[PDB]
């Protein structure tokens, strides 16, 4: 006879990509419970200006902040075929 | 005889892509319960200006902030075929 | 007879990619429970300007901050085919 | 008869890629519980300017800070085919 | 009869890639519990400027700081085909 | 009869890649518990400028600091095909 | 009858790659517990400038500091095909 009485008080605060918390696998027989690996198989005239949290062609996880991002300017981007006198 | 009495007080606050919290798999026999891996198989004259949280061609997760983003300007983007005198 | 009475008070704060916390595998027989490895199989005229947390072609994890990011400028990006007099 | 009464008060603060904390594997027989290795199999005219936490083609983990990042400028990126008089 | 009464008060603060903390493997028979090795099998005209925590083509772990990063400038990146008079 | 009453008050502060802390393997029979070796099998006209904590093609561990990184400049990177008069 | 009552007050502060602390292997029979060796099998016109903690193609461990890194400059990197008058 198997008996379980789990109690999990979980608090997740400002944690984006969290995974597999507070899980209870109770049984009389169990093969490969909780199988959650993280496998990664990585095979391998423009004037641009970028500011802030940016992704271009990624497969990456959650990008965030918990707080304040203060005033940003990006003041002046004079590029291709431009002429000033 | 299997007996379970789970109790999970879960609190998720400002956590975007969270996954697999507070799950209870109770049985007399169980094969591969809770299978949730994260597999990634990655095979491989314009004047632009960008400000803020930006994604262009990604397959990435939730991008966010919990707080304040203050005044931003992007004041002045004079590019292609432009003429000033 | 197997008996378990787990109690887990978990607190995750400002921790993005956390994984496999507070999990309870109770049984009378169990093969390979909790299988969660991290396997990585890595096989191998533009003027650009970038500011901030940036990913271009990655398969990387959550990028974040818990605090304040103060005023940034990126003031002046004069590149391709530009002329000034 | 197997008996277990675990109690884990866990606190994770500003720790991104944490893994396998507070896990309880209770049974009468158990083969290879908690299998979570970290295997890595690594086989092997533009003017650019970058500031901040950056990833380009990586498969790396969570990059973050817990604190303040102060004002940054990236003031002046005059590159390809540019002319000034 | 096996009896266990673990109690683990764990605190992880500003520790990114931590692993395998506070885990309890209780049983009457157990083969290779807690198998978590770290195996690494490593087989082997642009003007660039970079500032900050940067990864280009790595498979490395979490890169972070717990504190303050003060104002950085990257003021002046005049490279490919540039002309000044 | 095996009896165990572990108690581990663990504190990890500013320690990134820590591993295998506070783990309790209790049983009546156990083969190769706690197998966690670290095996490493290592087989073997651009003007660049880099500042800060940087990885290019590594499989290395967590790189971080716990404190303050003060103002850095990288002021002046004039390289490929550049002309000044 | 085997009896154990371990108590480990562990404190790890500013120690990155620490391993195998405060682990308790209690049983009536145990073969090769705590097997964690560190095996290493090592078989064997650009102007560059680098500042800070840097890894290029390594499989090395956590690189960090616990303190302050003061203002660094990298002021002036004039290399490939450059001309000044």
Residue numbers in the entry:
A (entry chain F), B (entry chain G), C (entry chain E), D (entry chain D), E (entry chain C), F (entry chain B), ...: 9 to 52, 68 to 108
The paper states:
3D reconstruction of the fibril images yielded a 3D map of the dominant morphology with a resolution of 3.1 Å, while the remaining minor morphologies could not be reconstructed. The rise and twist of the reconstructed fibril are 4.76 Å and −1.46°, the pitch is 117 nm. The fibril consists of a single protofilament (C1 symmetry). The handedness of the fibrils in this sample was determined by platinum side-shadowing, which showed a left-handed twist. The ordered core of the fibril consists of two segments that extend from Ser9 to Thr52 and Ser68 to Thr108. For residues Gln1–Pro8, Asp53–Lys67, and Val109–Ser118, which are present in the fibril as shown by mass spectrometry (MS) (see below), no well-defined density could be discerned in our map, suggesting that they are structurally disordered. The fibril protein fold is defined by buried electrostatic interactions, such as between Glu84 and Lys46, and by several buried patches of hydrophobic residues, such as the one formed by residues Val10, Ala12, Val34, and Trp36. The fibril quaternary structure is stabilized by an interlocking of the protomers in the direction of the z-axis that is caused by a 14-Å height change of the fibril protein backbone. The carbohydrate can be seen as extra density within our 3D map that could not be assigned to the polypeptide chain (red star).
